[PDB]
Design a binder for this molecule. Structure first.
Ligand code: IAC
Ligand code: IAC
Ligand code: IAC
Ligand code: FES
Ligand code: FES
Ligand code: FES
Ligand code: FE
Ligand code: FE
Ligand code: FE
Lengths: 435, 157, 435, 435, 157, 157
């Protein structure tokens, strides 16, 4: 009973705790799909996936199918994957190329790549009718909120909410670093996509990203096993990259506390302001030489000294800086979510960078990964246990202070539970703005 | 040495996997062998492209050793697996060259608690002879729906 | 929010367009099962399926299980498949024969074939009770709207709506032709039933029957392929019946426009008033000789010159005249429908007629059929695409003229979209009559 | 439309009949899970399943996960299987041993076996917060309605309803007999558990237990087949225990009528006050000798002459006296139920008793059992047929008399339909008390 | 006498079960043979522990005869079953001792009306020779999810 | 000529179907051969009774050629299929009469996008020798649930 009940929507979130209905209620999920995901900027793809004119990809955002295409003038356009005649899809598949126009596979209506109508077969049947007055004459319904930053494309279905610039603020710097680690300053999509289905609400996955108290407990059986296996080895023998990427998970509390956290407005936040778990990662001389040749000394040192752990763009994107890997959240139901992990190739860099990126992606994000197994087990346990009665709340009291209610850019320690509180404040705002 | 020996090798490897004798199963590999699960059909190699699993000796040992831990929270209760194999087909048989390639259709079932899933696909086996014992140099597992959305797979296929 | 809200039910249909909720809304499907399908005549079977006394078939209409049986006096009766004691089914399976009475398999209550109570075991336990005052004393609940035309049995669950005669009007002539193509004037069920599950609303399938704009576009990859494969052969070589039945799908617009369409009241309509796609189909001399011997030259010429393309009896039956094949619509949910295709044998005709009928049934209606694949892909595309926002309507403006609002028998061109509009007018009326 | 509608809840039950919505309505199932199963005592296990300190089992009652554990002082405690931090489960699996404390597998919060909080890692992060004021400071939520009788553990989630003693009355004597048939007076769990999924409401299974009208009709194809297969053999040859256990199902009407029935308050009732189908069951001399050595002639004769057919503790437990087997009802949905069958070993008895018990359990309660097949087919038929219109009631008029409305302990014949009426009266009361 | 005879015996038994020839299938057993379906993994015996099926000759005859009855309400319409077998493996082969043990992976499917279910597991066959004919002394059916919740299984596996 | 040749023929035909080599698969048929999928159990013939598939050479060529079209809207993205076969059993073997009949249990899986379906049943193969090459004269596919409600099946079984 939340429909048309904004006060009961606000009542599920308090200053330092939340209600269980945020993770289980299906009607809340439907209300989100109608309201929350239509009022925020969402990652739909990268510009390198549609380089040529007429190239298109298909996505699904907030229960809507979308075509993101490259118009003939070189721009990027977004439209509904729904024909103007009776609703049939125009393009079937994840990606493709339609040449100069879209042609419906039902009655062969034709539209331009920007969505405008081109031709209706046997038009002589519409002379004395009212087709030209309705909205089927305009063509496909378009989205006028499409923006690109360093190739990343963000869309916003509705017209309610802050614009791109004020929505993202200064978090975009993370993306810039991801793009500045290439001698050419460009990224391309390569290496394939890993798709993982979680039997849990998307919210828990979004919270696990900036939780520094979990890795030494849940991920003990694997990271600790690796740490013990590499123990007793000579300190001079090179560490296999698997051990290098697994060891930091079992660090002490002081390491994560000093590692640091920064939060922005609108639920965007990155972890690891001073250093991170990606700080050591050996060193490649040829890549450093290339970046030296392109940028210089000071600029190269500044770029490669920026080692953020991971960044969260609310509500569906997370990225890593020094690994060049992103994860996208695809909510399905109240207890079903799909996670897609992509990798990038830096233009002009030696292959070792992409090899390391693919190895990390396989080790961490694959459905066959042990770390993913442990995290999914934690999510499933939370989903099953949140049906008990009595205590009907979830605590977010760690490192809480009311002075955080002023907002803005806030820097703090690594074990703070501030990011979740900011996320839920933003979620409440985005729900209640359109009630 | 003989084709039937290779067929028996593949069958016995599946049986070893089914009975949870991981210590004996891992000893069949060569020291530099790989256990590969490609992510896309007709994948070129596991170095420059992502895969579901590309395990050397160290990663296989880690995965086997984690199963004996008392804090493997995702393995409580433990899972069970079953392999159903079509008869292996020997494609390449180089007796002089010491290299054998086998192709085997498979149906794999994994169950935990009241949950059960199944997959179908093909095994490619590269076998050689070390000191009179047949040993694997690469085990490639081609899944029919490798690029589809999958749930957690917690055991060796 | 349509329950007890009839004006919002009327608001989903306009003069020349409809809303998307007619194809997706599950609550609308439940309201239909309660209201629409209980207020219309529905095909439940043929008399040749239950020839002997005591023979019964079991059907499922509007969420109700039904037994259609042959009483001892030779008539046809319909009753609920629900025992009077506690609700258990009396007969399990698609068809059978119970002899003289029905016997419940739970506590062995017994009822007559017409549904009236016969005996209750250990009756001595009901002397001082109130069983004889309730409705369990009358036996099974019966249906008093059961009618038969040339063997076809139609039922109507409720008492609201026009009677059989006014409901069907003069469309029954189609059935008569189907029965007049036999020297004995009788049909029988033979050849088996094809069952096909569509992941789409039943409405889309009902529309695809009288849509002449689709076949040249959606069915191109198969019909055009067959046309090109034959095109090359000498014009004297006999055409295989597969090519004969496949070629007419890829005709030009003028052919389908000149084929013609006729519509009746209550959503019943047939296509191909003068000449159709079944018009050539070679010729059989023995069948013509038999019909000449039975009827004469004039009557045989009149009967065999009637070649309607297909006929729609709303809301669940469609038939073909010269092919002797029918299709039945079995709605399951908002996005799940079951289609059953039967074939008939004409009594006294040579086997070539049934061979041709079975060939056509396999080629067109099987789940392994390419034409079915294309049509199902179109339905699935429509179902997926109708969830997009913006334009929330489905256009039915083709060949629209307000003078059609007077109703009655209307004859028009082949590409008119009148039948859909008439269907939805009838659907609105049938829902709103009992709200 | 039953939510907050107590009068419409009462209107579905009359004096001698019930409505169909009690077996189909999903909203009614959810209301039950919120109200009915939270206001009655339910069987969660036996004390022999958790003998040692720290031993725990996990159960699922009324949509809540529960841990039932043995505290360090030897008592039995029940708590929610939900961590106080964010809701993750503490123990995964059906049973186990946690040592001295519970440790959450997400962030390693720790609680005592009685549920109280023990330690929070990195506590220095909660000094100036409000964690100590909330309910997460107390630890796990506990249940203070936990009771044990001869090892059987019963819980009651809420505080509304009669207490254990008044809830069960004098039906507990049945349990005592089940425990008095052991020379040591103790039971233990042995032989495994059979789990059977029924595609029917739990209510039908609960009704089938005290229905003496059905066995000679539904179970005819198996019990009658066995009776006819044995009928032929000399009367001196020993009957196989399969035939011994199968023959009584096909008795005449007078046998079941004279077998007898007794009913208590709150829906508890047992069948077979005078004799039962387990009356003959051959005889074991060593067991009788041991019982005589422990109790004496008179007490042994009294104990072994008490042979109730089966006993129903509403709403989820049924037991058998002379067979030492129980069945538990686990509702899942409106049309899905799970049935678990356990067996007991009598302490100090020869193995023949347990062999007979396991044979009966396999023959009757297994998913591979023919008797189970017939009963499940009856349930499925009832579930499918209760969707028909017209007669929308289920008759419970057999042997009905208004003088039974005074309540209390009532003894009557074997074919009376009183137990179902008492069950539904109690169900109505338990729903309406908390409305 | 020969191994291939034992493989053929197992295959033919599965085929007999598939084509509803129950009268011929039941004749392959010895008079004191058992058809065992354990309830728990590594179950010790079927006497002191519960099982899904522990049938002697009488119970097998009862089950076969019930299928011919016109009042087997749960068998209307009749169900159908299919067996897909991996090649049998002969573990123990005592030519002098007259006792043979075979292990076979199986995928079993059962369909009735519009409902279909499948199970996977292992068959253990104990075979001997009576009067020159191969006959079974025990048929053990190990299911992968024997202790999980199951629906009704109405035919012989 | 030999039984193993027929077993290899069936296995290789399944393999050819698995790797989308339709042009080579269709060449194994005789000119007047039929590819038959019955609709009811124990169906008499495909002439006077409806079937799911009763294809001669022309219809097989049409189906194969449609897959290469760029407007096969139902095949975007293309589907994938997998066959898992029990070892074929040679029922009749007429070396002099030039007639061979084989029976093979099969599990067939078809996947498209995130959708997957499976079927079980039996293949009956009629084989002959034309100019020294083994060729089919009829391929009958018996499905376990042939008369049940089915979804779209878009590839050759
Ligand atoms: O980024 C990763 O590799 C996984 C991950 C998600 N949240 C974390 C918090 C602390 C340490 C690692 C992770
Ligand atoms: O009857 C058929 O063969 C299929 C069919 C349904 N609607 C049609 C419209 C035009 C042409 C063919 C069809
Ligand atoms: O107790 C049993 O073995 C089964 C059973 C449940 N209700 C009955 C009623 C009469 C006779 C037997 C049973
Ligand atoms: S639905 Fe697109 S042309 Fe008709
Ligand atoms: S339900 Fe039919 S006799 Fe009782
Ligand atoms: S959820 Fe249990 S410690 Fe956090
Ligand atoms: Fe994690
Ligand atoms: Fe069509
Ligand atoms: Fe019963």
């Amino acid at each position: 009973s939340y429909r048309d009940n904004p006060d009961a929507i606000r009542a599920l979130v308090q200053d330092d705790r939340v209600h269980r209905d945020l993770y289980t209620s299906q009607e809340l999920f439907e209300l989100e799909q109608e309201h929350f995901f239509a009022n925020t900027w969402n990652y739909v793809g990268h510009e390198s996936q549609l380089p040529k004119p007429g190239d298109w990809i298909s996505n699904e955002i907030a229960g809507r199918p979308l075509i993101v295409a490259r118009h003939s003038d070189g721009s990027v356009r977004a439209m509904m994957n729904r024909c103007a005649h009776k609703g049939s899809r125009l393009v079937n598949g994840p990606c493709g190329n339609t040449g100069k126009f879209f042609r419906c596979p039902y009655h062969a209506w034709t539209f331009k790549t920007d969505g405008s109508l081109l031709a209706i077969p046997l038009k002589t049947g519409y002379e004395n009718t009212a087709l030209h007055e309705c909205e089927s004459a305009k063509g496909l319904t378009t989205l006028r909120y499409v923006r690109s930053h360093r190739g990343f494309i963000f869309v916003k279905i509705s017209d309610a909410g802050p614009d791109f610039d004020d929505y993202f603020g200064d978090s975009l710097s993370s993306i810039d670093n991801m793009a500045d680690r290439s001698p050419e300053g460009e990224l391309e999509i390569a290496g394939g996509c890993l798709r993982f289905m979680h039997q849990c609400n998307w919210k828990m996955f979004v919270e696990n990203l900036n939780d520094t108290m979990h890795p030494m407990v849940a991920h003990e059986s694997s990271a600790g096993t690796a740490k013990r296996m590499w123990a007793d080895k000579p300190e001079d023998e090179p560490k296999p990259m698997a051990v290098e990427q697994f060891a930091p998970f079992m660090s002490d509390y002081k390491f994560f506390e000093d590692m640091g956290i920064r939060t922005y407005d609108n639920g965007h936040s990155f972890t690891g302001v001073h250093f991170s778990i990606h700080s050591k990662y050996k060193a490649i001389p040829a890549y450093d030489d290339a970046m030296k040749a392109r940028y210089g000394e000071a600029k190269t040192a500044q770029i490669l000294g920026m080692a953020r752990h991971n960044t969260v763009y609310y509500p569906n994107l997370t990225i890593k800086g020094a690994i060049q890997a992103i994860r996208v959240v695809k909510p399905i139901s109240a207890d079903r979510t799909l996670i897609e992990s992509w990798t990038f190739r830096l233009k002009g860099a030696p292959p070792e960078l992409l090899q390391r990126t693919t190895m990390y992606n396989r080790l961490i994000n694959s459905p066959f990964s042990v770390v993913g197994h442990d995290d999914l087990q934690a999510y499933r346990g939370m989903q099953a246990g949140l049906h008990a009665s009595g205590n009907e709340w979830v605590s977010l009291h760690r490192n809480y202070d009311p002075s955080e209610l002023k907002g803005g850019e806030i820097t703090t320690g690594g074990t703070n539970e501030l990011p979740m509180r900011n996320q839920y404040r933003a979620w409440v705002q985005r729900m209640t703005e359109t009630m | 040495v003989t084709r039937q020996d290779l067929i028996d090798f593949v069958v016995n490897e599946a049986h070893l996997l089914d009975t949870r004798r991981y210590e004996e199963w891992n000893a069949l590999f060569t020291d530099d062998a790989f256990y590969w699960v490609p992510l896309v059909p007709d994948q070129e190699d596991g170095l420059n492209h992502t895969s579901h699993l590309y395990e050397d000796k160290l990663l296989r040992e880690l995965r086997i050793e984690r199963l004996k831990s008392p804090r493997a929270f995702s393995q409580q209760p433990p899972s069970r697996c079953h392999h159903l194999l079509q008869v292996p087909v020997v494609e390449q048989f180089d007796a002089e060259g010491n290299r054998f390639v086998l192709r085997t259709g498979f149906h794999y079932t994994e169950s935990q608690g009241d949950e059960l899933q199944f997959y179908v696909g093909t095994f490619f086996h590269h076998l050689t002879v070390r000191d009179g014992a047949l040993r694997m140099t690469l085990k490639r597992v081609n899944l029919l729906n490798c690029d589809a959305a999958l749930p957690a797979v917690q055991l060796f296929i």
